[PDB]
């Protein structure tokens, strides 16, 4: 399948080169997979989600996304126009308040929730969780992310936006999950992206158009935007049968575009997520 005039990041993930604008993907499109977006919520009524999104848990007075961040990330995973995996099922877990903040205890509870809740959902092709959030190093937060991964969920987490080594942030620094840095449309490391040996992969993160609350759209930047590209890619590849939740981060790194990014510090992987769709 081909989507013309796609957001640059979608085109990038199906291309061996920067500077194109058509996204190419197998029409299976993540059908039969599920992605949990653990964030500020999802505006499930947005037309872009087509009835494929739903809120399943909140820790606050409402499940509504009163911020937009979670809705944008969900859109990059799975919206019809802005998403990588255009037929996946999206499940929202609201661990962040409408200012984008949340306590680590709530975030941990949300990860353990997903590890169990997937047993209440129909995801025959596999389960992914996208975590566009983080703070300072916490062994308990890292352990929660490790448990979620161990339970059979492909966990993708943002590297963070400090232009620093991600070893000092969580869940970015957990070795067993997939830690995602950000790039721009000219194949440069995004100026804010964290780096370091704990990164597994880069995805598009500068100037990413996706869904927003109030039925709208906007372009924003962050490793929060790179992470759902990788989460949606994992769901897409799992639906194709090419990999599994336990192996998808390694598979994405194995099949990535290699050596194409600039301003990658010595010791950080130079790997850009790629669907290898022909």
Swiss-Prot record:
GO terms for molecular function: metal ion binding; serine-type endopeptidase activity. Residues 7-278 form the Peptidase S8 domain. GO terms for cellular component: extracellular region. It is an enzyme of class 3 (hydrolase). One of its GO terms (biological process) is proteolysis. The active site is at 39 (charge relay system), 69 (charge relay system), 224 (charge relay system). The chain holds residues 106 to 383 of 384 of the full protein. The lineage of its organism: Eukaryota, Fungi, Dikarya, Ascomycota, Pezizomycotina. This is Proteinase K.
């Amino acid at each position: 399948a081909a989507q013309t005039n796609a957001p640059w990041g979608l085109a990038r993930i199906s291309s061996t080169s920067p500077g194109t604008s058509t996204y190419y993907y197998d029409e299976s499109a993540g059908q039969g997979s599920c992605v949990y977006v653990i964030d500020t919520g999802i505006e499930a009524s947005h037309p872009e989600f087509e009835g494929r999104a739903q809120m399943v848990k909140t820790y606050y007075y409402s499940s509504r996304d009163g911020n937009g961040h979670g809705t944008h990330c969900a859109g990059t995973v799975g919206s019809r126009t802005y998403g990588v995996a255009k037929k996946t099922q999206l499940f929202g877990v609201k661990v962040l308040d409408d200012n984008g903040s949340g306590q680590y205890s709530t975030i941990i509870a949300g990860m353990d929730f997903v590890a169990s809740d997937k047993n209440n959902r129909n995801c025959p092709k596999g389960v992914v969780a996208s975590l566009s959030l983080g703070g300072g190093y916490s062994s308990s937060v890292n352990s929660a992310a490790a448990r979620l991964q161990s339970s059979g969920v492909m966990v993708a987490v943002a590297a963070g936006n400090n232009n620093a080594d991600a070893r000092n942030y969580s869940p970015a620094s957990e070795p067993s999950v997939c830690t995602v840095g950000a790039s721009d449309r000219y194949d440069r490391r995004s100026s804010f992206s964290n780096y370091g040996s704990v990164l597994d992969i880069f995805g598009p993160g500068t100037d990413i158009l996706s869904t927003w609350i109030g039925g709208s759209t906007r372009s924003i930047s962050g490793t929060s935007m790179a992470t759902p590209h990788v989460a949606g890619l994992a769901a897409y590849l799992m639906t194709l049968g090419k990999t599994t939740a336990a192996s998808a981060c390694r598979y994405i790194a194995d099949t990535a575009n290699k050596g194409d990014l600039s301003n990658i510090p010595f010791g950080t992987v130079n790997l850009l997520a790629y669907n290898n769709y022909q």
